[PDB]
Structure formats: structure tokens, C-alpha cells
Amino acid sequence: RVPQNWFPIFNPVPLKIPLQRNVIPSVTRVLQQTMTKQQVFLLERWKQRMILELGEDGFKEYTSNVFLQGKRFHEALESILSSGYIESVQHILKDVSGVRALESAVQHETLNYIGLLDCVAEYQGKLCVIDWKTSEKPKPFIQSTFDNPLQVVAYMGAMNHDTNYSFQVQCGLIVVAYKDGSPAHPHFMDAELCSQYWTKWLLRLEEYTEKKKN
DNA sequence: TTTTTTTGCT
Ligand SMILES: [Ca+2]
Ligand SMILES: [Ca+2]
Numbered sequence A: 001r002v003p004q005n006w007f008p009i010f011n012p013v014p015l016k017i018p019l020q021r022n023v024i025p026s027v028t029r030v031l032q033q034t035m036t037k038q039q040v041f042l043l044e045r046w047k048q049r050m051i052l053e054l055g056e057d058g059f060k061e062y063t064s065n066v067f068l069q070g071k072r073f074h075e076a077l078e079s080i081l082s083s084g085y086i087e088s089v090q091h092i093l094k095d096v097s098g099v100r101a102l103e104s105a106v107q108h109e110t111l112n113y114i115g116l117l118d119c120v121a122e123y124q125g126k127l128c129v130i131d132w133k134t135s136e137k138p139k140p141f142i143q144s145t146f147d148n149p150l151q152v153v154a155y156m157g158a159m160n161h162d163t164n165y166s167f168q169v170q171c172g173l174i175v176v177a178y179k180d181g182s183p184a185h186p187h188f189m190d191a192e193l194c195s196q197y198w199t200k201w202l203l204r205l206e207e208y209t210e211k212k213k214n
Numbered sequence B: 001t002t003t004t005t006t007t008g009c010t
Helices: A029-034 A037-080 A084-093 A148-159 A192-214
Strands: A095-105 A114-123 A126-134 A171-177 A184-188
Touching: A029 A114, A029 A148, A029 A192, A037 A084, A037 A095, A037 A114, A037 A126, A084 A171, A095 A126, A095 A148, A114 A148, A126 A148, A126 A184, A148 A171, A148 A184, A148 A192, A171 A192, A184 A192
Parallel strands: A126 A171
Antiparallel strands: A095 A114, A114 A126, A171 A184
16 A cells, blocks of 8 residues: 655756667667568568468467477576476586576677677587577578577677676587487587677678668 | 577579
């Protein structure tokens, strides 16, 4: 009936303060709104062909399942580092240690974006930001993970210039697990390769911010 | 909220 956390309302050219969360995008938002004419094609062609094979209500249910399987997977690791997918990654967890961060936020003070990275930990003695994920079809080459490398280096560059973090990171790791328990493909990205993908991430970033001008 | 997940052949 009464407030428990009291604070008063008063205290004894027009302003237009922008809202930071509006003008500072998220990594996933930068990439999803700067997809290539090829990505849009195969994605639209994949939805039309899947809705035809499962209907509108079914394809909406499909989206729900594969979304939850992932989210539950990510949470499971968040607990472990503190199911069929878990058996698939067991041969990778043996090589991971030195966990410095999990489901933690990164903000780029200068390039002005933000994100939530899955994990920061040592893989075979190499500190990288790690990007877990489930997948139905197999992904044997880093090319099969599409924009995921960009998402990873966006997170790295953000952390390396986020004063909430006392350390830097130079490598990236994409782990693709499978429901049938097949071992997980580890797609590692050494410092040099992350510099390659980083340059391409700046392009997507700059394409996005130009898109937001109009 | 962010993120979860989704991508061909001739
Ligand atoms: Ca995530
Ligand atoms: Ca992930």
C-alpha cells in the first residue's frame, strides 16, 4: 500500500537528449539489418519452402523449438563454466579453462555499440571470447557459421576497449554442437584471422550507421 | 534487452 523504496519527485534552444539505448545498437542488430542480398534470398527462400512444408502455425512452432534448444544450451554452459548438445561439446570442455567472463556485457566506448558475449576463457591455453551454438545441419568449416565470426570479433574489440574489463583478448572460438551428440566442431580464430574478420565487421557497422542516417 | 535460431545451384 506504501512505497518500500521512497525517493521524492522534487528537490530544491530546446533540449533534446538522445536515448543511448536507441542510438547505440547491439551487435546482433547491426548484423541482422546489414545482411547481404544473398543472405536475404536464401533466408526468404528457406522460410517460403519451410512454411509450405509445415504451415504458418507449424513454422512458428519450429522457430520456438530451435530457439529454446539454443537458449537452454547456452544456459547449461553458463552453469557448467561457473542432453545431446552437452555430450557433443564434452570433448571441447576438456580443453577450456581460465574462465574470465560468462554472459557478460561489452560496450565499445568509441565505436558505440554493445553486446552480450557468451564466454571468455582459455582454450588450449589461449584466451578467447567463445561463441557456443546449436545447429541442426553440420558446420564443418568456419564459413558454415556465416556471420558468427563477425559477431565474435565485435565482442572482442568491444571488451578490449571496455574499462569494465582489466584484460584484453586476441583470439575467437566458435563451437557448434549437435543434437545427435556428434562431437562438436571447434572453429578457432587466431589473432591474425580475427583481424581479418574485424575489418569486415567495421564495414557492417559503418553500413548500419549510414543506414540509420536516413 | 540481448540473444536464441534460420543460408544454393547451374
Ligand atoms: Ca549469446
Ligand atoms: Ca552463442
